[PDB]
Structure formats: structure tokens, C-alpha cells
From Swiss-Prot:
It comes from Homo sapiens (Human). The chain holds residues 284 to 307 of 593 of the full protein. This is Granulin-4. Disulfide bonds join 1-13, 7-23. Promotes proliferation of the epithelial cell line A431 in culture. Coiled coil: none annotated.
Amino acid sequence: CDMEVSCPDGYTCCRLQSGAWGCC
């Protein structure tokens, strides 16, 4: 989802409660 943080496992892009742009 992100340039630095890649989601090769095959996770979907979503918003984290903490307030960050990650994939769950």
C-alpha cells in the first residue's frame, strides 16, 4: 500500500485506528 511498507502477502488497503495508512 505504501512505498516503504509493501503488502506482498496480499493485504487490502485500510485505515488504522491509531491513524495510519496501512493494509489489513
